[PDB]
Amino acid sequence: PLVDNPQIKSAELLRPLPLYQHAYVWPYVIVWPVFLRVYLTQELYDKYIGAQEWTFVWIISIVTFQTLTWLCTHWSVNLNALFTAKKASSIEDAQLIKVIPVANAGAADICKLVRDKTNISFLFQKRRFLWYPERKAFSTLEFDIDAEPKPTLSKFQLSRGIESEDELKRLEQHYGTNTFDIPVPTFTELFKEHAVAPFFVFQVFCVGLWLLDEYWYYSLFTLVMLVVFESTVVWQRQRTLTEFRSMSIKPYPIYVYRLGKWTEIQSDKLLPGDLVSVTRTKEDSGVACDMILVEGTAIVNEAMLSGESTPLLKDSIQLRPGDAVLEVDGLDKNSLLWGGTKVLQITHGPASGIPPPPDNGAMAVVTKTGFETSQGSLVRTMIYSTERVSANNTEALLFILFLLVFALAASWYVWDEGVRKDRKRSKLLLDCILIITSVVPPELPMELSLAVNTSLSALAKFAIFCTEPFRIPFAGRIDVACFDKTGTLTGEDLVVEGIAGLGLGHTPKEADGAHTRMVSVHDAGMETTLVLATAHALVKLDEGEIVGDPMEKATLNALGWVLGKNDTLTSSSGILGTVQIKRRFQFSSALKRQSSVATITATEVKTGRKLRGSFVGVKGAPETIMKMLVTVPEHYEETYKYFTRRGSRVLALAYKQLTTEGELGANKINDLKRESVEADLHFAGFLVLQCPLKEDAKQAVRMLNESSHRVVMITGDNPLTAVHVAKEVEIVDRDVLILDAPSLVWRSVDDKIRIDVDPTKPIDPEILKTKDLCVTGYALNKFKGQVGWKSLLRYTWVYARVSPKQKEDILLGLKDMGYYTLMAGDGTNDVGALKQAHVGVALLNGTQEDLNRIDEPPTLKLGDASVAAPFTSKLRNVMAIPNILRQGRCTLVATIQMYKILALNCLISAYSLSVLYLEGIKFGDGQITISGMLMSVCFLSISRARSVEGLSKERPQPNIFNFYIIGSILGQFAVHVATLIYIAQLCDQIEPREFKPSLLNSAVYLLQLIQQISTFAVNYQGRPFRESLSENKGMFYGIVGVTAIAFACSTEMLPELNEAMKLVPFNENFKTIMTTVMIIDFVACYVIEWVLKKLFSDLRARDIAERRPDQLERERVRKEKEAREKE
């Protein structure tokens, strides 16, 4: 019924049908008595043959058709909807619904409708959908905080919880219980699920078919090898499900204000709208569900959602305008308690008029319960991480069908040659079906999953964890690698340079008139010291730790003052005073300033000059305070521009006195508007800070730029700092031009070129050709949708001063052009941007020494994955991005080599069987068993390979169908079939014509063994991405031993081993011809594969990542210098 969800493609309504009308019952009920009448009494042998073997063939064919029609319902959902069910009229009589998700959301499934009263609902991927008759469509549940019009704060500030019992029952029926429902099945249900998959039943059918031809050991070996693998997979899945269940939070008693009483209920019956009391959490516990603080403040530790153990600070919405302010999740982000955090402290113990709870805790209001929380969604998307097996297999099936044509040609030729020589039709058909069925590889469509699960183990050694593992192949096709700033490229070990520009209006100067004289923070004025000690937002734990932004911690450490009990600072500095913060206005990231009101009492030791009373301190961006001053100085703009042009961070300080003596009063300070306070300011000075670059930034950017990628930067600072950082990190090289309002004029860094451009006209080609670009946020906003917006995303690499919405806007605009993007951020400022990109990395702040003191990868506990981005690195190194880009590049290479090996093996086996069956002879049982065991040994021995220590300019192919895989497969197959035809013809020329040994059997067996080893030796993907064949002993010895064994059996070094495989002894000349033919075959295969790899393997870089010859020359001379300095 056209459900409303971005992750669902279509829907349909069905009704169930009785067992009589199922499509796998009634036609067989019609046709079986016809066959019984024909076989029993009718004697209509015209459409028959007569033998018992043909009766067996007819019975097998009928049973096979019936069970195939039955299994087609389990294999696909469309045939399930067609054969068993049938379409209904509308929602009034339908009982079943079919849901088909988006291309990478899982597998389609038939969902059952459940009706409760009027309400129609169904469960899809553990997510509840509801039927809204006013919209005539299905959609997910709607909560009070996620309405299309955002509710005001008067909804939550005056909330009184649940007041009626029928409302409680309605909420219980609507939203359900607050728990994680993860049902774990037993071994029987999982093996039933695994035993109906098409490839398992196909392998069972192949085993039965081989057993029909009197092969007792081969079928048993295949059955054992299949059964143990399936049992291992089922046991691993069961263990993973048990571990997933084990992480659910246990219920604990809590206080809920229900029906006017503070009744104690368990934490398993929370409903959206309840008024719960938050207290300090116990050991092995946490917040039950998402909340919003309505009174008091709390200090939390969100280590189960972001992977960081740094304490935070959360504040209530108690002191906000109740109805005049619409709730926004950009300014009120410090009021929501997420489900899974641990509360560490409660500071205080109301507008709603509610008596305090008995436990003396903060009051909150529940918003989301169940899987609809954040960590609930993370758990749900980690349960269904196997989207690589279900929403896939659309190209491997085509590869199997492509091999089936080469199978059918040989089978048809064998049948046509057999019908003209008067063969028995009960054996020729079996031989043809064996030739057909010996082609389909059983482990072909699930190669990508094994490669991904192998790469995930190597990634989990540098503390890099992946939540959605289908993005690993996406990491090998990256063209644009976007970067952030202040969380990725630059660290957080800020150092206070000093206070400069405080001498204005009262002297070294430059051409522009800037004041370069800089004064240390110790020898500063009293007002500036009071502003620095007033306008912070630091709070102290009872145990002695200080929490907050590292900027405030750094400036407090540089100031020298100490932090007291309750927002009181005393005092090395020469101020010798005390302050007490009354009211605090928080930073908003859009007003670009923060302010505070405090009571001061200072006594300067140099000139006395007592000062006491109310005080207002504000600290923010220098371009915003200038709009709030009363008299700007003579050289304000030039001074702050000069001090920010060198990569330093400049903040302005302003102060205002309210009362020269005496308190303002609690009632006055409790009721003050932000706009009235932040006006009529004085000037104190500038605070200058230097953010040091990370140690790995330059190397990890120089590796990305020189390996067919492109590195852009999307920051949020002023353009001068962004340009300086990009020049230090070597992103831009030539002269840059900043596009910003002065009109959207072009500006230079030194402000010597001012070129105006109109947004309707296209930009100048010379600007795009001879200069680098830095596009701001305002200019990009004024270029939205016009003709120049397509060429402003291909020639710009530094985006400065952009909102978090514009980041995902830029990422979407870059994705819509066909490029693949990567986003690396801190995981807090931008959340939608990290998910809009193809692959997103969230670089945390943990050091290596923190990790020191504290097969698929270890299953992700709640402290390992992050809710912001799919990938997550627990180390702060920038080098974590090339590791991902190298693993995602080696995965494609491994997949390509396995695809090239399996098809060649199958095509060799089929055309060996076709050559043998034209003469009437057949393989021995021991020979084929030894061949299978040796092939399995070689497969085990070849899989142990590792990667190189650096990136490469050559990119691998991303898909099967190209001019490299197909050409190599065809060439090697043609060489092998010509070799086999020549050997068969020579053996027929030498000796003219129950299992007995013969010359042709031994010759064909030896040739096919040698070819099946040569296709392992030749088709190994080596040098550029992974370790070479000759480097490691593990596969070299394995190949050499089996090659020597086969050659020794060929030339009769050990005649005792010959009788194990039933080989007729040869003479000298035939041995010489066989050895020469083997060597010629190997050399020709190697030459063809090397030529095709040298010609067609390289996938060239895009137009956005191509370098100029100057950069190539600089890279060459830098590599030459490094090679010279290596010794």
Author numbering: 3 to 119, 125 to 356, 365 to 521, 526 to 590, 597 to 767, 776 to 887, 1005 to 1143, 1152 to 1285
The authors write:
Subsequently, we also recovered an apo CtSpf1 structure, isolated without the presence of state-stabilizing agents or inhibitors, determined at an overall resolution of 3.4 Å with well-resolved domains. Structure-based alignments of the structure to P2-, P4-, and P5-ATPases indicate it resembles an E1 or E1-ATP state, which is typically associated with “inward-open” or “inward-facing occluded” configurations, respectively (RMSD 5.5, 5.0, 5.7, 2.2, and 3.0 Å to PDB-IDs 4H1W56, 3N8G57, 6K7G58, 6XMP23, and 7N7513, respectively). In the M-domain, we find a deep cytosol-facing crevice, in-between primarily M2, M4, and M6 but partially lined also by M1 and M8, that deviates substantially from the cleft identified in the E2P/E2.Pi states. The cavity, together with the arrangement of the soluble domains, renders us denoting the state E1. The identified inward-open crevice likely represents a critical aspect of the transport pathway, since the opening is overlaying the cleft of the M-domain in the E2P/E2.Pi states, and the cleft is lined by E458 and E462. However, the cavity is blocked by the C-terminal portion of the P-domain insertion, with residues 1005–1013 dipping into the membrane and inserting between M2 and M4, hence forming another link between the soluble and M-domains. Moreover, the apo cryo-EM data yielded two maps of the same resolution, where the only difference is the relative position of the P-domain insertion relative to the ATPase core, revealing additional flexibility. The observed ability of this P-domain insertion to block the likely transport pathway in the M-domain lead us to rename it the Plug-domain and the C-terminal residues of the domain (residues 1005–1013 model, but non-sharpened maps suggest it extends beyond D1005) the Plug, the significance of which will be discussed later. P5A-ATPases seemingly rest in a cytosol-facing E1 state, which is blocked by the Plug domain (green). The closing of the ER luminal end of the cleft would then push the helix into the cytoplasm, and following release, the cytoplasmic cavity is capped by the Plug-domain, as observed in our E1 structure.
